[PDB]
Design a protein around this ligand. Structure first.
Ligand SMILES: CCCCCCCCCCCCCC(=O)O
Length: 192
């Protein structure tokens, strides 16, 4: 699914524990990266610029329909591969196409059941987002939450620390769901 031969996403979740899950991927249609250029900055570490440098098959889009219907605020991600690597993981939160947060983290492979796992677990969600979410959930209507969320996106770049090569670049876009329907996601490939 979300993956190359070199690196695959296995789980991604953002949550609040008193455990509520805003989003959750547990583990394909195309989309033209040009469609979403204005949703991320034009600067260095910009989506157009990244996609230029390649490689094209490393770039994905997740659309999330999140659950704001509910503390410790955390982000748990887990990747896997067959090669032993050290990862640089860069998450950039963007608001109206401006980068407002960059979080840079590192994770060395751990051997388990004959593959290498990379566990970035219960990382504390930055306070920009915790505050943002507290506000967002005050809103009286879903359609108002989606309006606000049309201007909010996240870009995650995962690179081989030692070689500097891109392994994965994921663009995330957001709406809210009803609690009836629950959290949902749709993974796409980015093409050009
Ligand atoms: C609108 C619902 C958004 C909730 C999900 C959060 C998105 C994933 C977290 C991005 C990476 C963490 C960034 C950081 O807090 O430093």
């Amino acid at each position: 699914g979300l993956g190359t031969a070199r690196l695959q996403l296995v789980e991604f979740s953002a949550f609040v524990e008193p455990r509520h899950l805003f989003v959750h991927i547990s583990q394909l249609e195309s989309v033209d990266v040009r469609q979403i250029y204005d949703k991320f900055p034009e600067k260095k570490g910009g989506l157009r610029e990244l996609y230029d440098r390649g490689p094209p098959h490393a770039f994905f889009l997740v659309k999330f329909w999140a659950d704001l219907n509910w503390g410790f605020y955390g982000v748990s991600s887990q990747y896997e591969s067959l090669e032993h690597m050290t990862l640089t993981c860069s998450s950039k939160v963007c608001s109206f196409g401006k980068q407002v947060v960059e979080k840079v983290e590192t994770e060395r492979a751990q051997l388990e059941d004959g593959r290498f796992v990379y566990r970035l677990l219960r990382s504390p969600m930055c306070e920009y987002l915790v505050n943002f979410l507290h506000k967002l959930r005050q809103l009286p209507e879903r359609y108002m939450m989606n309006s606000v969320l049309e201007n909010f996106t996240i870009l995650q770049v995962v690179t081989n620390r030692d070689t500097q090569e891109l392994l994965l670049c994921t663009a995330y876009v957001f709406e809210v769901s009803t609690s009836e329907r629950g959290a949902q996601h749709h993974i796409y490939r980015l093409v050009r």
